[PDB]
Amino acid sequence: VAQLTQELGTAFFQQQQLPAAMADTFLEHLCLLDIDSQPVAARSTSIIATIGPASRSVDRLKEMIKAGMNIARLNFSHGSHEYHAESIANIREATESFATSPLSYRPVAIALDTKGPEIRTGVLESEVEIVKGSQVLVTVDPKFQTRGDAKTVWVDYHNITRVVAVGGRIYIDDGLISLVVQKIGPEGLVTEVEHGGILGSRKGVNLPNTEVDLPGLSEQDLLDLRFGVQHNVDIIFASFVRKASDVLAVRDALGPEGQNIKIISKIENHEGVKKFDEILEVSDGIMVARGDLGIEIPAEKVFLAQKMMIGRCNLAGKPVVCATQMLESMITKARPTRAETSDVANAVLDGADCIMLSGETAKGSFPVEAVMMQHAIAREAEAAVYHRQLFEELRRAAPLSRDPTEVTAIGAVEASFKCCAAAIIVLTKTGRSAQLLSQYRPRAAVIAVTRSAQAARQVHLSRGVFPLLYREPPEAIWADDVDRRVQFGIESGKLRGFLRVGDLVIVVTGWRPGSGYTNIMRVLSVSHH
Amino acid sequence: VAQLTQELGTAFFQQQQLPAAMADTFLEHLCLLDIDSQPVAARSTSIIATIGPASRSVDRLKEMIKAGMNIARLNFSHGSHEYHAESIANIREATESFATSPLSYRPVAIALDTKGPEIRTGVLESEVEIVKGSQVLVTVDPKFQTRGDAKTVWVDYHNITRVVAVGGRIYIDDGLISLVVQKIGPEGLVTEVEHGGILGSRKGVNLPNTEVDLPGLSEQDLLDLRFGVQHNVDIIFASFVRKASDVLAVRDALGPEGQNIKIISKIENHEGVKKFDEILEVSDGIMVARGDLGIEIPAEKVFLAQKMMIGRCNLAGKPVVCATQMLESMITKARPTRAETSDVANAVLDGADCIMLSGETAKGSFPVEAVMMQHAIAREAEAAVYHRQLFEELRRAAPLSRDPTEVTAIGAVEASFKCCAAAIIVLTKTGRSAQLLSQYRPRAAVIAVTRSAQAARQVHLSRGVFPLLYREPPEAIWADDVDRRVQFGIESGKLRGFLRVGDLVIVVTGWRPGSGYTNIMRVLSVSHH
Amino acid sequence: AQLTQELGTAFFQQQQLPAAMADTFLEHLCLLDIDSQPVAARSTSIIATIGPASRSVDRLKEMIKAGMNIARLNFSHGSHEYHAESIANIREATESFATSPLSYRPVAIALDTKGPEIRTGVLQGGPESEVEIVKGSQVLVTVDPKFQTRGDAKTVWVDYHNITRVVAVGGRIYIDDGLISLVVQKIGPEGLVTEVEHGGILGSRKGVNLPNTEVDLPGLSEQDLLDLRFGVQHNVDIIFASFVRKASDVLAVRDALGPEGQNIKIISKIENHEGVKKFDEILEVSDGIMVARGDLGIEIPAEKVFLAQKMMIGRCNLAGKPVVCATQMLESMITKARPTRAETSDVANAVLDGADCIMLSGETAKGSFPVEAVMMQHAIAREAEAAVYHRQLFEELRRAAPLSRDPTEVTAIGAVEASFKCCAAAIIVLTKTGRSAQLLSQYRPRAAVIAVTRSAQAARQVHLSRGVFPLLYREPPEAIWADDVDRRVQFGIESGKLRGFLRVGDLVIVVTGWRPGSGYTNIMRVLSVSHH
Numbered sequence A, B: 001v002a003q004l005t006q007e008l009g010t011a012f013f014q015q016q017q018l019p020a021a022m023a024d025t026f027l028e029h030l031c032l033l034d035i036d037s038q039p040v041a042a043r044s045t046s047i048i049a050t051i052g053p054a055s056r057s058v059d060r061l062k063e064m065i066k067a068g069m070n071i072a073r074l075n076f077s078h079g080s081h082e083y084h085a086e087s088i089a090n091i092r093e094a095t096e097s098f099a100t101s102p103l104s105y106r107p108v109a110i111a112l113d114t115k116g117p118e119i120r121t122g123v124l125e126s127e128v129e130i131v132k133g134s135q136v137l138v139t140v141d142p143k144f145q146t147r148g149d150a151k152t153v154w155v156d157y158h159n160i161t162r163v164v165a166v167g168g169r170i171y172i173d174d175g176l177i178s179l180v181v182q183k184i185g186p187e188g189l190v191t192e193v194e195h196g197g198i199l200g201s202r203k204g205v206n207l208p209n210t211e212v213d214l215p216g217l218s219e220q221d222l223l224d225l226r227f228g229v230q231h232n233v234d235i236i237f238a239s240f241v242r243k244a245s246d247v248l249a250v251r252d253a254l255g256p257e258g259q260n261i262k263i264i265s266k267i268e269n270h271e272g273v274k275k276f277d278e279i280l281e282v283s284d285g286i287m288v289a290r291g292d293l294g295i296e297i298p299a300e301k302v303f304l305a306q307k308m309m310i311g312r313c314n315l316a317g318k319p320v321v322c323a324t325q326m327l328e329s330m331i332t333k334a335r336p337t338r339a340e341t342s343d344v345a346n347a348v349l350d351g352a353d354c355i356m357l358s359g360e361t362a363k364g365s366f367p368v369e370a371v372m373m374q375h376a377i378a379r380e381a382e383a384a385v386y387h388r389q390l391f392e393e394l395r396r397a398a399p400l401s402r403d404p405t406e407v408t409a410i411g412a413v414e415a416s417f418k419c420c421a422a423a424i425i426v427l428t429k430t431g432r433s434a435q436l437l438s439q440y441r442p443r444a445a446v447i448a449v450t451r452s453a454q455a456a457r458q459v460h461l462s463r464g465v466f467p468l469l470y471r472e473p474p475e476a477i478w479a480d481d482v483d484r485r486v487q488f489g490i491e492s493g494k495l496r497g498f499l500r501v502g503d504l505v506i507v508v509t510g511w512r513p514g515s516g517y518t519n520i521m522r523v524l525s526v527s528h529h
Numbered sequence C: 001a002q003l004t005q006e007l008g009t010a011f012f013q014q015q016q017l018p019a020a021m022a023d024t025f026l027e028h029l030c031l032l033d034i035d036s037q038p039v040a041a042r043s044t045s046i047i048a049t050i051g052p053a054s055r056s057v058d059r060l061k062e063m064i065k066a067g068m069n070i071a072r073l074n075f076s077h078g079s080h081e082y083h084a085e086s087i088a089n090i091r092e093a094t095e096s097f098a099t100s101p102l103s104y105r106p107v108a109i110a111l112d113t114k115g116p117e118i119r120t121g122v123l124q125g126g127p128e129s130e131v132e133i134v135k136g137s138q139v140l141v142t143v144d145p146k147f148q149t150r151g152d153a154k155t156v157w158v159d160y161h162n163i164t165r166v167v168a169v170g171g172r173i174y175i176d177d178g179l180i181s182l183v184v185q186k187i188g189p190e191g192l193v194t195e196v197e198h199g200g201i202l203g204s205r206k207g208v209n210l211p212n213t214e215v216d217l218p219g220l221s222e223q224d225l226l227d228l229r230f231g232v233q234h235n236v237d238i239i240f241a242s243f244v245r246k247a248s249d250v251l252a253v254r255d256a257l258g259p260e261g262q263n264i265k266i267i268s269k270i271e272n273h274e275g276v277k278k279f280d281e282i283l284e285v286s287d288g289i290m291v292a293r294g295d296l297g298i299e300i301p302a303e304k305v306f307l308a309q310k311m312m313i314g315r316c317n318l319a320g321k322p323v324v325c326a327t328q329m330l331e332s333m334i335t336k337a338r339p340t341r342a343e344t345s346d347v348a349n350a351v352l353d354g355a356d357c358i359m360l361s362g363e364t365a366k367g368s369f370p371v372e373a374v375m376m377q378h379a380i381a382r383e384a385e386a387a388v389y390h391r392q393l394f395e396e397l398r399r400a401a402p403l404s405r406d407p408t409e410v411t412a413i414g415a416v417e418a419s420f421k422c423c424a425a426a427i428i429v430l431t432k433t434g435r436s437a438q439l440l441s442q443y444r445p446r447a448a449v450i451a452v453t454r455s456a457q458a459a460r461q462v463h464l465s466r467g468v469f470p471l472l473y474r475e476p477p478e479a480i481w482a483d484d485v486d487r488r489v490q491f492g493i494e495s496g497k498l499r500g501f502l503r504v505g506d507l508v509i510v511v512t513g514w515r516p517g518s519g520y521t522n523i524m525r526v527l528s529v530s531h532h
């Protein structure tokens, strides 16, 4: 390091947690972390924002995008087709409003989140108080579908009496209320309230440690997916995936016409956790859906499942998302808690490709500030990653490969470490080439230049890929068309402030048109032309 | 491992995250973590609970102690001597209520938390609304000491006009309200409200990135410390330590008569962080006081300072405490958020010796449940620690030593790993011998048998030390007195459920009476006598 | 390593590939396998000393086929014209193969300096009179020139004048392969009053060593100044500078090679304790190092030499400069067809230690099996090269090497990392000076670094760097520079194909630059070997 410190300035090595990057143990790494060491890199951890009343206006979205939202989540657990279709128009209006200047345009992906195997309570309307210590009944009786009170809950899962056990829990409304079952019979269940809040009407029920007969996709889901194809969505977040076949069902539904759509299976319960490896293998990636997961399993165990699934997805090289209550208190407050700040940082340090806002952006008072807070924590945490260890462990775990794109990608990432490259610039049609760079977690941003609008959107799922959408039509000479895409990477980089004159860039390209021929790594100096 | 699996049962190696313990990389470690793998060990991370209205009754304390409170924190920022003196009696009444049965008696330490260099607002009384966008004034004018409104704040730091800068912040009431200074003059400051809540009367002010002339100990502090000596407290949490001399001031105050009291310096601001190494060297340990720290420094950087200080304290072998908002939402709610759960786990995985509750126990609706939730997260996180790496890194970092107690301690911890010892049993007068075991972070509990009531209390600061207070008077033959203290460790272990017949224990003792002669490690089977 | 399905079960049996996949060095050792056959590409260079048994053009030709890469001219013996006869003989043997330039093996020529000598005077006149000395004795070492010929059993004179000053009371005086030791007792005006320790027979003008003494001689005799200038005249690739002791001795050789010899590669020979102590400063200003174990194992205890060897190979590996292991590697083979079990072991362990080259002295120069010596070193080195634990070596070198903004450095480590991901048969590099190939060498890839060059000198000099197989390209530039680049690469690959280094469906990493002239290497491509 003594020589770049005479060339790049003493202060270059004070930023990006570079003193901590050069440590020889994880422990020493931790000791050298410095609050005055400023993140300089662009932010690599994608932000996912749930659209709802607080974030659906075209002007709201424009501020979200400016703040750093990369992916928009449509939760089909609430709202009609036309409501969502309008969310989509407003998002594409906001996004496409920056097309004016191609060099600074930010692709925004749109993720459709399924309703999935849901269990709802009755019309019970307004609201009624439920009391801890107190005896509540659960019935499947179609007459009570319309009645309901502090003493009786109806629920639309007919066979509930066949699946629970004595001492098992029934949780209603995102786990707000807890009932312990004491007696099972064919008429219904007899329950004591363990946790008593105020019950609304047609709420969500969870039954931990049960096998519920509800099939892969409800009729409602089949429809919701065909909407997504019709509206050209980029990603499905598949709710409550329990086994592989559940993911295959989803793929079949999307059929030939939506085979390029990414399936992110949400692990929400003990079944998904247990069947995780088989879910991973057929999904495009994973969401640690900590909300359902923290009622389906004991709450003090969610961190184990989080770190497990993130690790296995890092090892598999498929994107993984951390979700739910990351900045919960910013629903009502403008500044998050010390534990929220911690949780966002620890999700990045764990190895998450994406972090997610729900309430915070859908309904809260501070949607834009939440996005801004995730963006600011993420940048700090990314630079505090111990790349030495991480890269070496990924290097080792990864199999040998005779695939030129794999070979090229690992040489390029190594190269970027050797010189502290400001960027790896890569041409990709499908995103694949950038993904294989991303899977080694380089410090250097992976600037992916593509003509596929859809690719530019989907690559937000892979940590460290900055998609640039290329709009100009083919030069006549292919080699020229290549240079210009590369030159567009650089100029965009310059304008967006990720690259400056004198920076080194690694440039990854291929020897002919089409997917699958990336085979070339160059080392260039950014220049003034 | 194939042989203990034929001896101890296949299922022994399914618990304590033992499959993950046997992994060869950190990454693989993470992948093997298992939500069905049950923590079996006792909980090693001490819990600190702030005493206040919700946790001051003798009956409340008894449930706190049962739930797992190890250290009681008296916050001298609120309350009079007689109020606190009564907190102390109630704590000692609760604690000493279990002396009935020596084999299950749990020492409870009492920590005195200083008021420290405080800056307070005026009598302003009741409450008044302060508004974002709006022009507020700060004055030192003794006339306004009694007035105050949505347009004027008084504050008792006379020289405030001499220490701030334009664009600097003034934060009032645990950072509830934020003012940006725009004009400085000798009469006062002119400020815009950035963050507007509701102001009370005589609240706390923070001035980030300023040097305030306020001396080491205020007059009030001198007194508060002499109370602590008089009331036999175990620990000082020294508020807002800024430099070493601040810690020496505290030690001088306690004078000869309180030289065995432990000083834990609270790092709350950019000055303490910068001067951390020199603070550590003279303190007995550290508190990451994330509350003040998250307003004194940018909030998105607290995790860097946390992980830094925890690492440096692990490396130094001195206790370190993580504090503030760990389970904040349990002030009003019975179940914490997914990020609170995360934060507690990540503080244990970071290497914290102690975790802390404030609001959650002092004033909230759910004091006992908060303690129970910290206890349950901590147990899970402790077993998910990657001991392979951690022990090796501590082994390496630690200097060579010709001190027999150091030598013995590292052999013993190695030994405990070889056999998955249920416990290391150690005789200590002062606690030192158990501390040097603790500093290598064994999986096996360090059961410390002592006659010093005060030691039994203070060793709660060191991760993994379970103090047992020994009450029987000296056998005539010293060797016999040793065996019996050791036999008391075992029986206590048996009764409390940390040891069973057939378990291996490492037993650490010394060759003569007095501190400093620990030099002996034995390997024993727990027996039926 | 599940890919096995495409390259065959067979592939992961060979090259010590199971031992390469071990997580620990101990597991690595455990998985070493005598049935796991090595590749043809042998990456550690053989320096053969040229003397009586290795001068015949027929023998040189055999020695080249056996796998000799550098030819050492020991200028301690032989005449200028003797040597020019050797040089011309070598060139003839080398150039006899230029006829098929796809299998042409460049052969470097190294000039081994005579350097600071210290000789004993004549014994009572006669040049074959052989005194004896008794152990518990008294002996005298003199400056005085009349004793030159008056050489008693009690008194001897020696070339080196300034011993009075430089050897102190207690210093040791070894004579003839350290057969005779003297502990210096008194620094008299007479000379040095010594006490014998070991004894035996004598002669006149036989080597003497000054253990732990800082030799006064300038580090270039007049004979060196003259041998060097001859070296420049005959276009030698490499100097082995004898008895290097400090940095100034290396600069003295660079000074004496002058502007005409700027591109001669200087390998400082570490022969003595002062050498070992000043090693780092010597290494800063040299292009490499010889571990000259002959003289070293007299000038320091024999049991300490493996320590000096291992330290110097490690420090050179760290610096990324070649290092030679020299002396008695196959001693027995002078007289016998086959080596001892300690000799093969010594060769394998030099390679596992990290030696860029291994040397044969008498085994090739004056001995009865020079061709089979070469063949032995060649066979052991291929087996030992595969038993290297690259996972740990590559990891340590990576971590030890500094960050660089030099695109050649950057490209190189990228290429080496790529080679490892896919078990590349080769890294094909274009280089004018050798530098681009050396910068690959430094990371010790398992794949052969096939260096394509038009520089005949570079192609020869590059044998110093482990794993670099030089090819000489003769064709004149194509019209279009890009077509000229591609033709060199193709030469590289077809050259490989002919020699067995490469087979169709192998991956290669191809390293090249963006424009002509040195220092512009900046491109790495992954390609398949073609013409299925």
Ligand SMILES: O=P(O)(O)OC[C@H]1O[C@](O)(COP(=O)(O)O)[C@@H](O)[C@@H]1O
Pocket: A427, A428, A429, A430, A431, A432, A433, A434, A509, A510, A511, A512, A513, A514, A515, A516, A517, A518
């Ligand atoms: O990442 P993917 O989808 O394989 O795309 C990589 C491809 O992009 C290119 O660089 C350029 O291809 P196009 O000119 O066909 O867009 C190819 O050379 C390479 O194979």
Ligand SMILES: O=P(O)(O)OC[C@H]1O[C@](O)(COP(=O)(O)O)[C@@H](O)[C@@H]1O
Pocket: B427, B428, B429, B430, B431, B432, B433, B434, B509, B510, B511, B512, B513, B514, B515, B516, B517, B518
């Ligand atoms: O941990 P410390 O304070 O050094 O105490 C260790 C001491 O305790 C003992 O085991 C027993 O000492 P006492 O019998 O004096 O309590 C000593 O042998 C040993 O030196």
Ligand SMILES: O=P(O)(O)OC[C@H]1O[C@](O)(COP(=O)(O)O)[C@@H](O)[C@@H]1O
Pocket: C430, C431, C432, C433, C434, C435, C436, C437, C512, C513, C514, C515, C516, C517, C518, C519, C520, C521
């Ligand atoms: O190894 P060196 O001395 O830097 O030589 C490397 C040079 O070889 C090349 O591949 C070809 O250059 P030439 O055509 O000058 O031989 C250059 O692009 C590159 O800079």
